[PDB]
Design a protein around this ligand. Structure first.
Ligand SMILES: Cc1ccnc2c1ccc1c(C)ccnc12
Ligand SMILES: [Cu+2]
Length: 128
């Protein structure tokens, strides 16, 4: 029984988990992201973004084009189910979303949209 998860993004461009599980009982789910690194947001910034596996590449590509000022995320991206802000060393940010937005049978992935990061900083979020 739980409806939250704590996640860390470090100076080595890694999340401390590649798989998140969400209990179907949860009406809402919360992700608590933190950055235990010493590097600045402009060189090793991280955010936690959720979308379907099929929408990831698009969110990432458009995110990079949107730039640092937009936390590397296209404004009001309909493909984004949930998103934290872009954080740097010592920062934290939480995001809560409705579990109803997730439909079983569908593949969901979480990732960081800072340029190049999704290559390593990505994982699955499933609902069972
Ligand atoms: C890697 C991968 C890509 C796409 N779909 C899938 C997988 C792996 C497992 C899986 C299962 C168990 C059910 C439905 N789709 C997939
Ligand atoms: Cu990152």
């Amino acid at each position: 029984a739980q409806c939250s998860v704590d996640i860390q993004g470090n100076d080595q461009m890694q999340f401390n988990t590649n798989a998140i599980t969400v209990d179907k009982s949860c009406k809402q789910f919360t992700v608590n992201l933190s950055h235990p690194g010493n590097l600045p947001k402009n060189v090793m910034g991280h955010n936690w973004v959720l979308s379907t596996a099929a929408d990831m590449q698009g969110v990432v590509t458009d995110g990079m084009a949107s730039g640092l000022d937009k936390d590397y995320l296209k404004p009001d991206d309909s493909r984004v189910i949930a998103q934290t802000k872009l954080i740097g060393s010592g920062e934290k940010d939480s995001v809560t979303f409705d579990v109803s937005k997730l439909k079983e049978g569908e593949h969901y992935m979480f990732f960081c949209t800072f340029p190049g990061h999704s290559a390593l900083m990505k994982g699955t979020l499933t609902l069972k």
